[PDB]
Design a protein around this motif. Structure first.
Motif, PDB file in Angstrom:
ATOM      1  N   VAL A  14       0.788  -1.202   0.000  1.00  0.00           N
ATOM      2  CA  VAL A  14       0.000   0.000   0.000  1.00  0.00           C
ATOM      3  C   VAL A  14       0.820   1.251   0.000  1.00  0.00           C
ATOM      4  O   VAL A  14       2.056   1.245   0.062  1.00  0.00           O
ATOM      5  CB  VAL A  14      -0.892   0.071   1.234  1.00  0.00           C
ATOM      6  CG1 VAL A  14      -1.909  -1.016   1.223  1.00  0.00           C
ATOM      7  CG2 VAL A  14      -0.040  -0.049   2.482  1.00  0.00           C
ATOM      8  N   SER A  15       0.112   2.358  -0.050  1.00  0.00           N
ATOM      9  CA  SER A  15       0.772   3.623   0.135  1.00  0.00           C
ATOM     10  C   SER A  15       1.164   3.782   1.610  1.00  0.00           C
ATOM     11  O   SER A  15       0.307   3.822   2.457  1.00  0.00           O
ATOM     12  CB  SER A  15      -0.135   4.742  -0.307  1.00  0.00           C
ATOM     13  OG  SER A  15       0.657   5.899  -0.506  1.00  0.00           O
ATOM     14  N   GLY A  16       2.474   3.828   1.904  1.00  0.00           N
ATOM     15  CA  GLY A  16       2.997   4.016   3.266  1.00  0.00           C
ATOM     16  C   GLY A  16       3.831   2.834   3.742  1.00  0.00           C
ATOM     17  O   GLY A  16       4.498   2.872   4.776  1.00  0.00           O
ATOM     18  N   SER A  20       8.985   3.316  -2.147  1.00  0.00           N
ATOM     19  CA  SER A  20       9.940   4.323  -2.606  1.00  0.00           C
ATOM     20  C   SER A  20      11.201   4.446  -1.730  1.00  0.00           C
ATOM     21  O   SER A  20      12.314   4.324  -2.226  1.00  0.00           O
ATOM     22  CB  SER A  20       9.238   5.666  -2.688  1.00  0.00           C
ATOM     23  OG  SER A  20       8.404   5.707  -3.835  1.00  0.00           O
ATOM     24  N   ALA A  21      11.013   4.703  -0.439  1.00  0.00           N
ATOM     25  CA  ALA A  21      12.135   4.958   0.459  1.00  0.00           C
ATOM     26  C   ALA A  21      13.104   3.813   0.562  1.00  0.00           C
ATOM     27  O   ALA A  21      14.267   4.067   0.810  1.00  0.00           O
ATOM     28  CB  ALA A  21      11.658   5.345   1.868  1.00  0.00           C
ATOM     29  N   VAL A  22      12.631   2.567   0.437  1.00  0.00           N
ATOM     30  CA  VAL A  22      13.519   1.400   0.519  1.00  0.00           C
ATOM     31  C   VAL A  22      14.119   1.079  -0.871  1.00  0.00           C
ATOM     32  O   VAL A  22      15.304   0.726  -0.995  1.00  0.00           O
ATOM     33  CB  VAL A  22      12.788   0.149   1.008  1.00  0.00           C
ATOM     34  CG1 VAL A  22      13.766  -1.044   1.091  1.00  0.00           C
ATOM     35  CG2 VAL A  22      12.053   0.385   2.318  1.00  0.00           C
ATOM     36  N   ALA A 121       3.750  10.401  10.711  1.00  0.00           N
ATOM     37  CA  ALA A 121       5.083  10.925  11.034  1.00  0.00           C
ATOM     38  C   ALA A 121       5.624  11.696   9.863  1.00  0.00           C
ATOM     39  O   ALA A 121       6.794  12.054   9.803  1.00  0.00           O
ATOM     40  CB  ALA A 121       6.062   9.804  11.445  1.00  0.00           C
ATOM     41  N   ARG A 122       4.778  11.956   8.904  1.00  0.00           N
ATOM     42  CA  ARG A 122       5.221  12.793   7.825  1.00  0.00           C
ATOM     43  C   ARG A 122       5.044  14.268   8.240  1.00  0.00           C
ATOM     44  O   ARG A 122       3.945  14.809   8.241  1.00  0.00           O
ATOM     45  CB  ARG A 122       4.448  12.464   6.547  1.00  0.00           C
ATOM     46  CG  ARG A 122       4.590  11.041   6.114  1.00  0.00           C
ATOM     47  CD  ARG A 122       3.866  10.705   4.822  1.00  0.00           C
ATOM     48  NE  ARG A 122       4.844  10.498   3.780  1.00  0.00           N
ATOM     49  CZ  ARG A 122       4.551  10.212   2.518  1.00  0.00           C
ATOM     50  NH1 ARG A 122       3.272  10.094   2.141  1.00  0.00           N
ATOM     51  NH2 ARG A 122       5.537  10.033   1.635  1.00  0.00           N
ATOM     52  N   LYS A 123       6.144  14.906   8.600  1.00  0.00           N
ATOM     53  CA  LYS A 123       6.136  16.296   9.022  1.00  0.00           C
ATOM     54  C   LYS A 123       5.225  17.073   8.137  1.00  0.00           C
ATOM     55  O   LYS A 123       5.168  16.830   6.954  1.00  0.00           O
ATOM     56  CB  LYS A 123       7.522  16.877   8.911  1.00  0.00           C
ATOM     57  CG  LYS A 123       7.772  18.042   9.867  1.00  0.00           C
ATOM     58  CD  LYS A 123       9.187  18.012  10.502  1.00  0.00           C
ATOM     59  CE  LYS A 123       9.415  19.163  11.435  1.00  0.00           C
ATOM     60  NZ  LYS A 123      10.139  20.305  10.816  1.00  0.00           N
TER      61      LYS A 123
HETATM   62  N1  LIG Z   1      11.079   0.925   7.917  1.00  0.00           N
HETATM   63  C1  LIG Z   1      10.699   2.258   8.029  1.00  0.00           C
HETATM   64  N2  LIG Z   1      10.786   2.881   9.200  1.00  0.00           N
HETATM   65  C2  LIG Z   1      10.452   4.146   9.355  1.00  0.00           C
HETATM   66  N3  LIG Z   1       9.992   4.884   8.350  1.00  0.00           N
HETATM   67  C3  LIG Z   1       9.859   4.393   7.130  1.00  0.00           C
HETATM   68  C4  LIG Z   1      10.206   3.015   6.871  1.00  0.00           C
HETATM   69  N4  LIG Z   1       9.986   2.803   5.574  1.00  0.00           N
HETATM   70  C5  LIG Z   1       9.497   3.954   5.049  1.00  0.00           C
HETATM   71  N5  LIG Z   1       9.465   4.910   5.988  1.00  0.00           N
HETATM   72  C6  LIG Z   1       8.932   6.289   5.918  1.00  0.00           C
HETATM   73  O1  LIG Z   1       7.501   6.071   5.889  1.00  0.00           O
HETATM   74  C7  LIG Z   1       6.789   6.832   4.935  1.00  0.00           C
HETATM   75  C8  LIG Z   1       6.372   6.050   3.694  1.00  0.00           C
HETATM   76  O2  LIG Z   1       7.333   6.386   2.713  1.00  0.00           O
HETATM   77  P1  LIG Z   1       7.444   5.825   1.341  1.00  0.00           P
HETATM   78  O3  LIG Z   1       7.499   7.045   0.434  1.00  0.00           O
HETATM   79  O4  LIG Z   1       8.739   5.056   1.116  1.00  0.00           O
HETATM   80  O5  LIG Z   1       6.255   4.956   1.022  1.00  0.00           O
HETATM   81  P2  LIG Z   1       5.538   4.816  -0.320  1.00  0.00           P
HETATM   82  O6  LIG Z   1       6.343   5.073  -1.572  1.00  0.00           O
HETATM   83  O7  LIG Z   1       5.182   3.369  -0.383  1.00  0.00           O
HETATM   84  C9  LIG Z   1       4.101   5.755  -0.190  1.00  0.00           C
HETATM   85  P3  LIG Z   1       3.819   6.424  -1.755  1.00  0.00           P
HETATM   86  O8  LIG Z   1       3.254   5.334  -2.649  1.00  0.00           O
HETATM   87  O9  LIG Z   1       2.877   7.583  -1.591  1.00  0.00           O
HETATM   88  O10 LIG Z   1       5.140   6.879  -2.336  1.00  0.00           O
HETATM   89  C10 LIG Z   1       7.833   7.856   4.565  1.00  0.00           C
HETATM   90  O11 LIG Z   1       7.635   8.859   5.546  1.00  0.00           O
HETATM   91  C11 LIG Z   1       9.182   7.139   4.699  1.00  0.00           C
HETATM   92  O12 LIG Z   1      10.264   8.017   4.952  1.00  0.00           O
END
Ligand SMILES: Nc1ncnc2c1ncn2[C@@H]1O[C@H](COP(=O)(O)OP(=O)(O)CP(=O)(O)O)[C@@H](O)[C@H]1O
Ligand SMILES: Nc1ncnc2c1ncn2[C@@H]1O[C@H](COP(=O)(O)OP(=O)(O)CP(=O)(O)O)[C@@H](O)[C@H]1O
Ligand SMILES: [Mg+2]
Ligand SMILES: [Mg+2]
Lengths: 171, 171
Positions: A14-16, A20-22, A121-123
């Motif tokens: 899902v979204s969240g 992306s971040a990983v 936790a997204r500022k």
């Molecule tokens: N293991 C983890 N621990 C803490 N924070 C994490 C995390 N993995 C991701 N995040 C953070 O959690 C949130 C989700 O981010 P992320 O952008 O990677 O998800 P996403 O790409 O799946 C949602 P979207 O589809 O809208 O891009 C971001 O604030 C990211 O920095």
């Protein structure tokens, strides 16, 4: 034309969940081809989402075919390609899979409370609950019968999430 | 729908001038979106390239339009989009420009002596001369009338090219 020697990995969930971040971090680490799929919607789709509306499944047809095409392109020249695509529904997964015997999914799995805590936790980001509830509703977790699905515990610090991702990659 | 406050940079230049390597660090460090344009070639192109046939300017028509499209998509949700694509001929540049007033080029500019020692620098790589001459043969240096083209000098080690690229970006 299909180098069964190279592989393509699709981060989903899902979204969240963390896609992306990983994914950013993994490609940076294994030094590999990474593509975010939000980037391949047809001009038609961008205007519809911009006009404040939800794309429907027909709109996703041409998108996922584009992505599938893009999967095809990355694995001609890279052994490890990551594409971000939440791909919640098992039919999107089959759209990607077709003609890509070397594509597989990596599913960043978590429950609601975990992912909810992550987005609030997204500022500065105001968190709306219905959006995430639609994500869980839509999510058709891949079953056991989906055998090219690998799985990851996002309940873990990103870096743990990262490391696990790499493992199931090198596994 | 064109967010004139978000911008797309295309890393152009010849094959060998550092397009992908430079764009990955600029994406890493700037925490911004990066799309490598090889990946948007129509299934047809992958096969023509595979069979060994070169692409002509007709086969790039559909590819550059897909990219132009992709440019559209990245700047909806990001202030800084970097798209790797050689962009040799002025015409290819015009096609990415269309629709995207909020796009620009960063020319990884070098001369022949430099790019060659570089392509030869990797082990196991069997370097072909014509391949780079042609490159330069094809190249249509962005002239002074193309005012969205910034230029970065590559006769500098990887990190100053990353650093200079970032400057032209923040400049
Ligand atoms: N293991 C983890 N621990 C803490 N924070 C994490 C995390 N993995 C991701 N995040 C953070 O959690 C949130 C989700 O981010 P992320 O952008 O990677 O998800 P996403 O790409 O799946 C949602 P979207 O589809 O809208 O891009 C971001 O604030 C990211 O920095
Ligand atoms: N400023 C610099 N200093 C030293 N090495 C560099 C460099 N810029 C690029 N390289 C190295 O030069 C070679 C070209 O890499 P790169 O992938 O960026 O070229 P390119 O993107 O232009 C190839 P192509 O266009 O075929 O995709 C690689 O060995 C890269 O590691
Ligand atoms: Mg994402
Ligand atoms: Mg490259």
């Amino acid at each position: 034309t299909t180098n069964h020697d190279h592989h393509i990995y699709v981060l989903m969930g899902v979204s969240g969940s963390g896609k992306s971040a990983v994914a950013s971090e993994v490609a940076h680490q294994l030094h590999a081809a990474f593509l975010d799929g939000d980037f391949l919607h047809p001009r038609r789709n961008i205007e519809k989402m911009a006009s404040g509306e939800p794309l429907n499944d027909d709109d996703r047809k041409p998108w996922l075919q584009a992505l599938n095409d893009a999967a095809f392109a990355m694995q001609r020249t890279n052994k490890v390609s990551l594409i971000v695509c939440s791909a919640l529904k098992k039919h999107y997964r089959d759209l990607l899979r077709e003609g890509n015997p070397n594509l597989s999914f990596i599913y960043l799995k978590g429950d609601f409370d975990v992912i909810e805590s992550r987005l609030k936790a997204r500022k500065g980001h105001f968190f709306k609950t219905q959006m995430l509830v639609t994500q869980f509703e839509t999510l058709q977790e891949p079953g056991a019968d989906e055998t090219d699905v690998l799985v990851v515990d996002i309940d873990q610090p990103l870096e743990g999430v990262v490391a696990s991702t790499i493992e199931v990659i090198k596994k």
